[PDB]
Amino acid sequence: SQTVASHVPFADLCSTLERIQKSKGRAEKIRHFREFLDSWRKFHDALHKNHKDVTDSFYPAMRLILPQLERERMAYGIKETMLAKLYIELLNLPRDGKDALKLLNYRGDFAMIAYFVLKPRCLQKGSLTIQQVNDLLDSIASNNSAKRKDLIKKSLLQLITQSSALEQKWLIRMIIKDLKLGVSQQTIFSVFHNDAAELHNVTTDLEKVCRQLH
């Protein structure tokens, strides 16, 4: 009950973001984003067929696809260096080791390095819905607005331990706020809008046509 975001897995979104960035060309990129759009609406329909009158707000997902436009949540307070010490301990790898130093370096991006050491170690499924990921990102920003780095770590741990490595790859970019999709926000907005207006736009309905065009 309650929302679409509460029923769609975080994994679905990450699955899509992967297929987007991995593809060459604006065409295949749009196809994949549109797939997610279509999926979202399919969930909505299934909920209403099951008598749960949810809203189909895409915002829970849009806010993660375009994390650098996030303005409801405040700053995460998660410096990219804080992340390294957490992963070192989470699987208890030795400091100044092969994988330990790679994450302790700086600049593809940090997320691609974390994924490189997470893929063979798993602790995966994952489990989180999008709403729950959002709920945890909310708590991180709140813990940071209140100057509680300890609570940031705990909240952060909760996402990690419950996320697959692919899932973790994308969280990190959502936190750092650079997705690197290879498709602009302008087109994302267009596809999103065009998707809606192709559906919810009066074309041949005479009663609605006559009233509106006056």
CATH number of the domain to which 3 belongs: 1.10.3260.10
Method: X-ray
Nearest 10 degrees: Cα torsion 6, 12, 13, 15: 170
Peptide bond into 97 cis (omega under 30): no
Instruction: Outline where 122-205 has alpha helix (H).
Output: 130-145, 149-161, 165-176, 185-197
- Helix, strand, coil share of the chain (percent; to 5): 65, 0, 35
Cα separation of 87 and 118, whole Å?
A: 9
3 backbone dihedrals φ, ψ, rounded to 5°: -145, 160
Cα separation of 137 and 132, whole Å?
A: 9
Cα separation of 186 and 204, whole Å?
A: 29
Nearest 10 degrees: Cα torsion 54, 55, 61, 66: -170
Q: Considering only CA atoms, which of 214, 158, 177 is closest in space to residue 78?
A: 177
Q: Residue 19 sits in which domain range?
A: 1-214
Q: How many CB atoms lie within 10 A of CB 28?
A: 14
Tally of domains within the chain: 1
- Give Cβ neighbours of residue 190 (< 8 Å, ≥ 6 apart): none
